[PDB]
C-alpha cells in the first residue's frame, strides 16, 4: 500500500517524528503501514497507534458535536449537509481502525489482548455516538461484547491497579452511562474499580504508578459529576 | 463530557 | 471543481460552520470554491479566506520548524525524508493561494487591493522560509515587490491607523528582518509605522480601533525583541 | 519568532 515500500523501522521512526510535529494524520498513517507489515506491536508501538488515531478521531468528534449542536438549535440544508460530511469521515476512520484490529492485531500476551479489545469497544463506542436505527444498537452490542471480553481477561490476569485495566473500566463505565442508558452500572463499576485499586494499592508498579494514580483520579472525577 | 483515556 | 455544484452562498455558510468547528482545511476548501465563482469577495469574505489558509499553512510551518530543528541537531534519511514531505505540502498550499490571487482576486477598492497584495507577499514569504538556491531569492524578490506595491497604496489611500496598513507594515518589517537579512530597515519601518499611528491617533475608527491598537502593540513587541 | 498577522 501507500507505505509498503518503507522499512517497518523507518515507519516507527516517522510515527514518532509526526507525534513531535503534531501531525496525527501522518502518525496514524505511518502506524497503519507498520501494523500492515504483519508483525505484532510492542507495548510502545501499541501506544503510538492508539495515540495517533485517538487524536484524529478526537478532533472529528469535537467537530461533529459542534455542528450537531448547531443543527439542534437550528430546529437551509447546509448544516445537516456539513454535519453529515464530517460524520462520514469519522465513520471511515473508525472502520479503518476496527479493520486493523480484526485483520491484524487482535489475534497473545494478556495485556496485549486487553489493549486491542478495549480499542475495539472504544471505536465501536464512537460509531454508536453518531449512529441511528437498526445500524445503531448493532453497534452498541459490538461495543459491549468487546468491553466485556476485555473486562474478564483483565480481572483474571491483571492486578487492579494496572493502568490498562483501570482505563478499560473507566471507558466501559462511560459506555454504560452515555451509550447504554444505564447510569446505574456505570456508577457501580466506576466505584468498584476505584475501591478495588485502593484495597490493593500495594500492587502499583514502579513503571506505571503515575498512570494508575491519574486514571484513578479520573474515575473519581466521573463519580463526582455523576453524583 | 465524562473522562475517557 | 470539487465545489462547483454548490451555491456560492452555501459555500460561505459552510466556511463559517467549518471555522466554528476548527476544520480549517474544509474552511479553505469552501472559500476557494467561493472565490472560483468569479465574483469579488466582501471584506468579511476576504477575511474568511485569509483565516482559513493562515491556519492551514500555520500548522504546516510549525511542523516544518519542528522537523527542521530536529534535522539540524541530527547533523538514517528518515528525518530529511519526512521534513521534505511536509515541506512539499506547505509549498502546495502556498501555490494554491498565490494562484487564487493572480487568477481571480488581485485584479478594485484600495483596501481590497492592499489586502490581496499583502497576502501575495505573505505566502511568498512562507515559500522563502523553506526555499534554497536560484529558486529562493526569485521568491524573495516576488515577496518584496508585492509588499512594496501594497505599502505605496496604503500610504496614499489609507490612514496610518488602518489595521490593514498597520498589519501590512508589521509583516513587511518581519520580512526585512527574517528573510531579507536587513534588521535595519525592519526596525526603521516598525518604528515609523508605530510613531505615525500615534501622531494621528485621532484617525482610529469606531469599527476597527480594537484591531489597530492590537497591531500597534505587536509592532512595539517586535521592536522590544529587536532592541 | 516575531509577530505577524
Ligand atoms: O499516555 C499514557 C500512556 C502511555 O504513554 C503508556 O505507555 N501507558 C501504559 C502504562 C502501563 C501499561 C501499558 C501502557 O500502555 C499509558 C496508558 C494508560 C492507559 C491506557 N488505556 O487506554 O487504558 C493507554 C495508555 C496515559 C494515558 C491516559 C492516562 C494515563 C497515561
Ligand atoms: O481577526 C482580525 C480581523 C478580522 O476579523 C477583520 O475583519 N479585520 C479587519 C479590520 C479592519 C479593516 C479590515 C479588516 O479585515 C481584522 C484584521 C486586521 C488586520 C489584518 N491583516 O492581515 O493585516 C487582517 C484582519 C485581526 C487579526 C490580527 C490583528 C487584529 C485583528
Ligand atoms: Mg502517553
Ligand atoms: Mg478575526
Run of H or E residues at A122: helix A110-130
Angle made by CA atoms C69, C72, C73, in degrees to the nearest 5: 90
DSSP string for C19-56: HHTT-HHHHHHHHHHHHTTSS---HHHHHHHHHHHHHH
Give CA torsion, residues A132, A138, A140, A142, to 10 deg.
-150
Neighboring chains of C (3 or more beta-carbon pairs < 8 A): A, D
Angstrom CA distances, C94 to C99, C104, C116, C207, stand at 8, 15, 14, 31
| Domain count of the fold of chain A | 1
Domain assignment of residue A77, given as a range? 8-226
> How many C-beta atoms lie closer than 10 Å to residue C155's C-beta?
12
C35, C41 contact by CB (below 8 A): yes
**Cα Rg of chain B, angstroms:** 5
**Three-state SS for C2?**
coil
Backbone angles phi, psi at A22, to 5 degrees: 65, 40
Among A85, A80, C27, A70, CA closest to C11: C27
- Distance between CA atoms of A96 and C15, rounded to whole angstroms? 28
* Radius of gyration of chain C from its Cα atoms, rounded to whole angstroms: 18
DSSP A68: H
Q: How far apart are CA A11 and CA C96, in angstroms?
A: 29
d(CA A72, CA A161): 41
Nearest residue to A123 via CA among A89, A97, A100: A97
The 10 Å CB-count burial string (b at 16+, else e) for C182-212 is eeeebbebbbebbebbeeeeeebeeeeeebb
**Per-residue CA distances from A100 to A3, A37, A164, C217 (Å):** 15, 12, 20, 51
Closest ligand by atom to A19 CA: 3
Please judge whether A23 and C86 are an interchain contact, meaning their C-beta atoms are less than 8 angstroms apart: yes
Q: Which of C10, C20, C23 sits opposite A78 (nearest CB)?
A: C10
Resolution, given in Å to one decimal, reads: 2.3
The answer to whether C127 and C88 have CB atoms below 8 angstroms apart is no
Report if residue C2 sits inside a domain. Answer: no
The radius of gyration of chain A from alpha carbons, rounded to an integer in Å, stands at 18
CA nearest neighbour of A49 among A104, A91, A4: A104
Please tell me whether residue C202 adopts helix, strand or coil conformation: helix
**What does the block give as the cell for C91?**
509549498
Pick from C114, C215, C218: nearest CA to C166: C215
Residue of B nearest to A171 (CA): B4
Task: Determine the Cα–Cα distance for residues C124 and C219; give it in Å rounded to an integer.
Answer: 21
What does the alpha-carbon distance between residue A160 and residue A167 come to, in Å, rounded to a whole number?
11
Ligand 2 centroid to residue C163 C-alpha, Å: 6
CA distance C152 to A94: 53
Question: A204 — alpha (psi -120 to 50), left (phi > 0) or beta?
Answer: beta
- Residue C1 in domain: no
Quote the crossing angle between the two packed helices A209-226 and A163-178, to the nearest 10°.
20
- Coil, strand or helix: which one is C131? coil
**Cα distance between residue C28 and residue C35, in whole Å:** 10
Given a contact cutoff of 8 angstroms between Cβ atoms, the answer to whether C73 and C40 are in contact is: no
Nine-digit cell at C155?
500610504
Q: What share of chain A is helix, strand, coil (3-state, %, to 5)?
A: 80, 0, 20
Task: Take residue A168 and report the three cell numbers written for it.
Answer: 478499560
Q: Do A49 and A41 meet the contact criterion of CB atoms below 8 Å apart?
A: yes
Q: Do A177 and B5 touch (CB under 8 A)?
A: no
Q: Flag whether A3 is in a domain.
A: no
Does A44 map to a domain?
Answer: yes
Q: Is residue A18 part of a domain?
A: yes
Nearest Cα to Cα of residue A64 among C26, C11, C50, C3: C26
Alpha carbons C176 and C148: distance in angstroms, whole number = 12
Please tell me which of the candidates C10, C17, C63 has its beta carbon nearest to residue A23.
C63
Which residue in the block uniquely carries the three cell numbers 507594515? C169
Q: Which residues of C touch A76 (CB under 8 A)?
A: 10, 13
Taking the alpha carbons at both ends of chain C, their separation in whole angstroms is 50
| Distances A168 to A61, A139, A172, A187, A215 between C-alpha atoms, Å | 20, 18, 6, 14, 10
Domain CATH code at residue A27: 1.20.190.20
Q: Is residue C3 part of a domain?
A: no
On whether residue A176 sits in a domain, the answer given is yes
Handedness of CA A30, A32, A37, A41 (dihedral sign): positive
Amino acid at each position: 500500500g501507500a507505505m509498503g515500500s518503507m522499512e517497518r523501522a523507518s515507519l516507527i521512526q516517522k510515527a514518532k517524528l509526526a507525534e513531535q510535529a503534531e501531525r496525527y494524520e501522518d502518525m496514524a498513517a505511518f502506524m497503519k503501514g507498520a501494523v500492515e507489515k504483519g508483525e505484532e506491536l510492542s507495548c510502545e508501538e501499541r501506544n503510538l497507534l492508539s495515540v495517533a488515531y485517538k487524536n484524529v478521531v478526537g478532533g472529528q468528534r469535537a467537530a461533529w458535536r459542534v455542528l450537531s449542536s448547531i443543527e439542534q438549535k437550528s430546529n437551509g440544508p447546509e448544516v445537516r449537509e456539513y454535519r453529515e460530511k464530517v460524520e462520514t469521515e469519522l465513520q471511515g476512520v473508525c472502520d479503518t481502525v476496527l479493520g486493523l484490529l480484526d485483520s491484524h492485531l487482535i489475534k497473545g500476551d494478556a495485556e496485549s489482548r486487553v489493549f486491542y479489545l478495549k480499542m475495539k469497544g472504544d471505536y465501536y463506542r464512537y460509531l454508536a455516538e453518531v449512529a441511528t436505527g437498526d445500524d445503531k444498537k448493532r453497534i452498541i452490542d459490538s461495543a459491549r461484547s468487546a468491553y466485556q471480553e476485555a473486562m474478564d481477561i483483565s480481572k483474571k490476569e491483571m492486578p487492579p491497579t494496572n493502568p490498562i485495566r483501570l482505563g478499560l473500566a473507566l471507558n466501559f463505565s462511560v459506555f454504560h452511562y452515555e451509550i447504554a442508558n444505564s447510569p446505574e452500572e456505570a456508577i457501580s463499576l466506576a466505584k468498584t474499580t476505584f475501591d478495588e485499586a485502593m484495597a490493593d494499592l500495594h500492587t502499583l508498579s514502579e513503571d506505571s504508578y503515575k498512570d494508575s494514580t491519574l486514571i484513578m483520579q479520573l474515575l473519581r472525577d466521573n463519580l463526582t459529576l455523576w453524583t | 463530557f465524562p473522562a475517557t483515556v
